[PDB]
Curated annotation (Swiss-Prot), chain D:
Shown residues within the full chain: 441 to 525 of 548
Subcellular location per the Swiss-Prot or TrEMBL entry: Cytoplasm
Chain positions recorded as ATP binding sites: N39, A40, A41, D55
Similarity section: Belongs to the chaperonin (HSP60) family.
Source lineage: Bacteria, Pseudomonadati, Pseudomonadota, Gammaproteobacteria, Enterobacterales
Job description of the protein: Together with its co-chaperonin GroES, plays an essential role in assisting protein folding. The GroEL-GroES system forms a nano-cage that allows encapsulation of the non-native substrate proteins and provides a physical environment optimized to promote and accelerate protein folding, probably by preventing aggregation and by entropically destabilizing folding intermediates.
Self-association and partners: Forms a cylinder of 14 subunits composed of two heptameric rings stacked back-to-back. Interacts with the co-chaperonin GroES. Can form asymmetrical complexes, composed of one GroEL and one GroES, and symmetrical complexes, formed between one GroEL and two GroES oligomers. The asymmetrical complex is the functional unit. It was suggested that the symmetric heterooligomer may represent a transient intermediate in the chaperonin protein folding cycle.
Posttranslational mods: Phosphorylated reversibly during heat shock. Can be UMPylated on a tyrosine residue by SelO/YdiU, probably under stress conditions.
Protein name: Chaperonin GroEL
Free-text comment about domains: Each subunit is composed of an apical domain that binds non-folded proteins and GroES, an intermediate domain and an equatorial domain that binds ATP and is involved in inter-ring interactions. Forms a large central channel that appears to traverse the entire length of the cylinder with no obstruction. The central channel of GroEL functions as two cavities, one in each ring, that are separated from each other by the crystallographically disordered 23-amino-acid C-terminal segments of the seven subunits. The entry and exit of polypeptide seem to be restricted to the apical end of each ring.
Amino acid sequence: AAKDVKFGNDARVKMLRGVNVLADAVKVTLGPKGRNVVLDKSFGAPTITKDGVSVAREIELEDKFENMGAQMVKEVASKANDAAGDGTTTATVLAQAIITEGLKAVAAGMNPMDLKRGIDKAVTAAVEELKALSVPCSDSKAIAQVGTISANSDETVGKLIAEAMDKVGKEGVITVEDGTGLQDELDVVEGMQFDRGYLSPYFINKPETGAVELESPFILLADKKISNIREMLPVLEAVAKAGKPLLIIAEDVEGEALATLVVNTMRGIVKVAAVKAPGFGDRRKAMLQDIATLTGGTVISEEIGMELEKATLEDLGQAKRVVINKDTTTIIDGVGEEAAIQGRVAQIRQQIEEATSDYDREKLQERVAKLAGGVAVIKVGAATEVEMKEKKARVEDALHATRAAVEEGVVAGGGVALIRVASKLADLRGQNEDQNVGIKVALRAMEAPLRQIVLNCGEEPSVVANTVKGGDGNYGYNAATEEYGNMIDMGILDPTKVTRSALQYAASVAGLMITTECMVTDLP
Amino acid sequence: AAKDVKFGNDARVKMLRGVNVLADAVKVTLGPKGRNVVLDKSFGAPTITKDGVSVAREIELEDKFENMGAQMVKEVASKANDAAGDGTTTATVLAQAIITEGLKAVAAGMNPMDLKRGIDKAVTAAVEELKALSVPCSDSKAIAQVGTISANSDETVGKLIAEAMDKVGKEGVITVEDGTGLQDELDVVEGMQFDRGYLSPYFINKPETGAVELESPFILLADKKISNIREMLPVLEAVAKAGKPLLIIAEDVEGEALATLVVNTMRGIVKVAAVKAPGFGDRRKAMLQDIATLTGGTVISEEIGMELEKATLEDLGQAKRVVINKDTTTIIDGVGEEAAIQGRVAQIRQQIEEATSDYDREKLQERVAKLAGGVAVIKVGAATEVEMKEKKARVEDALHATRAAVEEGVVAGGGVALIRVASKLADLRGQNEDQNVGIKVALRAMEAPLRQIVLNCGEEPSVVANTVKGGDGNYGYNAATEEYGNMIDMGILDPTKVTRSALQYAASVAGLMITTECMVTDLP
Amino acid sequence: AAKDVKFGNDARVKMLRGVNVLADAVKVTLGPKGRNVVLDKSFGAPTITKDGVSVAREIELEDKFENMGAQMVKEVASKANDAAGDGTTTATVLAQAIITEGLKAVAAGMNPMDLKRGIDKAVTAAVEELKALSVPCSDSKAIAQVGTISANSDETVGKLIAEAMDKVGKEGVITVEDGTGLQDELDVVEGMQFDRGYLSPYFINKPETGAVELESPFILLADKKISNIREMLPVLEAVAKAGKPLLIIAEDVEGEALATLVVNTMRGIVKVAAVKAPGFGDRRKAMLQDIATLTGGTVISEEIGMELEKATLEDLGQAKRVVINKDTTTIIDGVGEEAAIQGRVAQIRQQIEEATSDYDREKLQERVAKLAGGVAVIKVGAATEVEMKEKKARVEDALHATRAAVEEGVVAGGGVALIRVASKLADLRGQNEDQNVGIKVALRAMEAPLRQIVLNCGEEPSVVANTVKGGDGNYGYNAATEEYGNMIDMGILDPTKVTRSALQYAASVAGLMITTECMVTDLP
Amino acid sequence: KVALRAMEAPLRQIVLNCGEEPSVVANTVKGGDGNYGYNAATEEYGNMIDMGILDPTKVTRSALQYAASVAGLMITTECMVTDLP
Ligand SMILES: Nc1ncnc2c1ncn2[C@@H]1O[C@H](COP(=O)(O)OP(=O)(O)O)[C@@H](O)[C@H]1O
Ligand SMILES: Nc1ncnc2c1ncn2[C@@H]1O[C@H](COP(=O)(O)OP(=O)(O)O)[C@@H](O)[C@H]1O
Ligand SMILES: Nc1ncnc2c1ncn2[C@@H]1O[C@H](COP(=O)(O)OP(=O)(O)O)[C@@H](O)[C@H]1O
Ligand SMILES: [Mg+2]
Ligand SMILES: [Mg+2]
Ligand SMILES: [Mg+2]
């Protein structure tokens, strides 16, 4: 409908004020001494979090022009989270510093577009510098330090995470779930496992809980539902000749087959249990080949040249044992060759290098870990429920941070890396003076993440920065201990990827944001 | 949508005031002299209760920030109820004292994150102390004392509950129902009983009331409904041959089976009555195996290897006698070996140790009680329906408290245990001064439950506390008798579990709550 | 219903003000130093653009009469975009200049109709001048310069665009898609390709990802779907006999045909893969003739005179090899005579000059490019989503501008061409004085685009223009370098078509707009 | 702590008025000893008395004693009385 128009300074002032509100709320959660922010929920109990991105999503302003400024700055915090899942609070601070200084430059009559180019060039130079500074983080102690630092300096979190990454491996999958107790627990899963129950509660091999343990079983994979069509007897009787247990994978099994099966198992003629496939057509069908190849078995292609009783005992896969409960089925170890195992993994490389990334890579990776790596689950400890989400969320941030630290390395924390790189870039200049100022402005903004940490500690942000700048390399001030030294020695580490991403995302929105002459919005 | 934001002290002050309103309403219901709170309902007659958790649920505030404070403290009261079902009012009081002192520390300029750690560390130390103070609750008199104390010092309640736990047993099930009369009454049921009536009103053995008593009957368990499938006559005949009564359990019996059956029972050929299974198929089928094993019978596996005709007379379970009426069927004692009964119970151990807890365990235990234990029902007397609500509610609290006291033991009441443990922890300090203050803050908050009891009695909370602190061991002040002495001697007992849970839940919410810098809420 | 009516002077003032608001918002985005405009969305995050047409669309006014003026000027910006996709901001400026001066003439008591046609005569004369000044632009450097100038002086954009036009050719199709990285990337597609995957994932010729490469394959085109009328064996057998791979194009291929086909391909009997036709009935059927003629094959006309079985091996088309994946099918090169390729293209000439224009020629040309030319895709780099649309939008404007520059040539930029033509037309007069004033008004308005650019920069618009007028030929002022010289040397180019279109569209609406005596609108 | 911390403010105020960093100047001044300090007029560090910037000991004392006297006096005040508009 009809819209309100603001030009130049009036538009920018409202924009900045909106930006300041969002940024101020986000800043208080930054650092070891960072403070919690509570998001009010109508639906249920209020949520308290130290996560800047979570706070950013919630904030919208009554003033349409101020709101627009806040909405645009909101995205940098949101984008940083997508990139690495950490440093979102830090990224917002850089946007605050850049925008305020950029607008100040704009007031002078300097061309904003030139200022943007200066900032962008400064950013590009800064990114290259970060890569040179990044030190590899391949040791468990360093990994623990990043986890601990991400989790608002919780030593126990870093400790548990380090244990898990070493254990699962480089390509393994680690997740976190709410714990029943007040104590944090770690679970490690060995071999292939999936969320399938047994269709025959009656057949329990030994332990109670519906637990089935088959010793050196034959594994069958099929593409069809089994009901009245019994004809598969020569395959099933072949198993009887062997005197070994049979594991069945198919779309479904109904009582007719199960009825004969339960009696056959009861008298010891055959020890056989049947379970349903993984779940969805493109899902379960895709995961069947790997199960079969891993166990050395053959998938029955209903679709291709195969039939229900057309398939010898040769076709069935072999495993030393399987554990089945009402909710899950696990194979101890299917017997298959590494070349086939690795080969299945090798064909997975296209699957791994997929445009979708989110959703596709994590489930896919799960197969990868199940096929050769492993799966780890972490339980979170806390007395009620509000404590549990906060504790849990930070652990995930640490989980994401460690994954990032391993792949791209780490840099000194406390904002020292950005301030240290700024000194390095003091000689960078552009096409004209407006660009030179823009460059210089970006360098100025680099300092802010460091000083927010100090500010939140109730100490002079400027005084600490002057001494830190005075220092060399990794020298910096530890907010927790309230003293100077070497940041790396202390254990305060920033994954290079989050540091890099924060600066780039903050700068990307900020350059365009400062160049806005006119803003348009609807009246109340 | 659009957000209203408060920072620092303004946020915390609003939060505190909201918490104070919630806690003030809760406090008046704490102690022997505690007073009732009336909750209004547009639906019908208002509910009056001394139960703090119920009062907490109903409190919501007009001020959006104040409401946020109250909503967060609401959870500690509610969480405590989930754990033990008692001490919810006491837990709220601890939250009140911890929060007020914690915020005061925050005002001082101390880092709240550190304050939280001090509190959390202090809580862990306090919990360990409670276990050492805790003494076993085994005798009936002590159980009665906890029941009596829980039910706002009602002696009759403690007396009746003690009789029931001893009588039913350690794993027995106790419930409470309203009473027809003005007097409290206890009902105890032994053997296997269920809420199933008879399909044939016509077959009444001796007492009229739909009452069927069969002497040395054979019990039939089935997985199908019998409409036109009257065939099974050789089974029925085998029973006619036996000359013994027949009890029938199956999904349903139609008039066709009943019609022939009625004539057969009336002229003396056979005495047979049929009743429909427990209710829902997974649930009825699950309870059928125990019924058969308990009576030494065999469940007919229509599903597995059994048919309607196929089943010998010996398959049927045996019992001394059964009692049947329109609403319920009861078996005096099925004849089964002690080992088999115990064995079903043994497989139930997985069932007992279930992640579900709520609902699954209650029903599970009921099966277990029927299998080997006993079931008790308590009726509550009162002239009016609302009086009945208050009286009954307190009885349940005592029931939960006794269950808690038996499993985890008891500690001295009147808040003496928390104040007594506080003296012990005077030696606890940590990483920094802010933590030390946080620890100290928690110790001070410990005192509050004791003083609220005294405050509600119209006496100086501080003066009684000074003498209590002055005392040793279990020495304390009895609010009801208005004098000092040994609390254990008095008969005032606090189950260790409720006391521990209250402190833990109160502190966990309080630690995060005191660390809040910014609050977000919707506009008026 | 019930209309508010304004006459003469009051109506025109309201109209002018509405126009001025719209124009002023548009004006700030004109030039190298032009500034961005942010459009607020209730849906997602706000949009930031320098594109005048996008801004014009979003502007609606609270005052009903002013809004009417704004809506009326909105079309000139919208029409310019439709004609060339560039020059929309400039067109609005001309409308601003013409209308303001025209209204002033109206105020004098001059006949508006005479003023309007005087303007129209001047416009027609100005257009003729533009063709004379227009110079060819067939060289890559000049094309790059227009791309760079359109993209708000971004050199990298102009460089990449020039490369694509040269390589795909005159009739090639170029589109732009968001890039995953922070860098710009160019993709070129050669040969015949369509967006359809394979219905047989099982048959992969060599590389994974479903990549199928058939060497010297036969191509089958059909108007059929195949279920159980597999009966095409004589055709399939003929191919088996030849030992060559088969590619199948038809409405659908399913289960039974694929099942047998899969076994045949795996064991080496035949190497055959099938893919679904292009998409919709007439659309896919229309594209079948070209596929078959290109490959030298014959489409199976179910409808005309051919049967499923009926078709010899010669009917099938031949290609060197094809590339197939899960979402795309590509033919390296079908062997077909150029006379046939051009002949297919020749029948396309009617298709090319189709009244539909929008949509029809774009897709039609895509077929054309696939038939003989090439297809190019450009990817745009940016850290965040808001940067991404702005960067990409400008690239599209440049893409459209280059297309316009090639077909109609270019003129010197900075508004120099309009100012230069205006000096030439100083001798143009009409039937009466009122027309003569209108002519003069048009010439006067021509100057404005030049001065608006300078005004955006921050320099005196009149001073620069006075010196520019003093100059000759292509002499002008470069806003970005802040100096005078030859605009062509500089690399500042305006496609003749956008320049011409802006002037004609602005003038057409402006003439009618200044002739308004009375306005009709609804009440508040 | 309130009294000691309050002492710092006049220095900071001097520097703040000048448009210089109060925290940075205060930090460096704290490091020094005796009459060493920052001269706001000349923007440099040295012996303030030698430089020519000084206050009588009596005025500094009197200002500090009165400020504390009134502050404490307000802190202990529980009631205020005035006429309505
Ligand atoms: N104890 C500490 N001492 C000094 N710096 C710290 C300490 N803990 C964390 N930091 C730093 O401050 C930054 C922000 O903390 P954090 O709240 O985790 O923000 P993110 O949420 O990481 O923006 C870190 O990336 C790190 O460099
Ligand atoms: N007669 C009494 N004398 C002293 N203390 C008592 C007496 N009765 C109860 N108390 C104490 O006060 C607490 C609060 O009573 P209650 O109403 O049951 O609150 P909860 O609802 O248990 O907070 C008890 O747990 C107990 O320690
Ligand atoms: N650096 C420059 N120096 C002088 N003129 C320029 C420069 N850059 C662009 N222009 C001119 O100003 C016009 C407006 O730019 P543009 O934003 O693309 O508007 P349109 O969107 O073209 O109205 C161009 O068509 C061109 O002639
Ligand atoms: Mg973090
Ligand atoms: Mg109680
Ligand atoms: Mg343009």
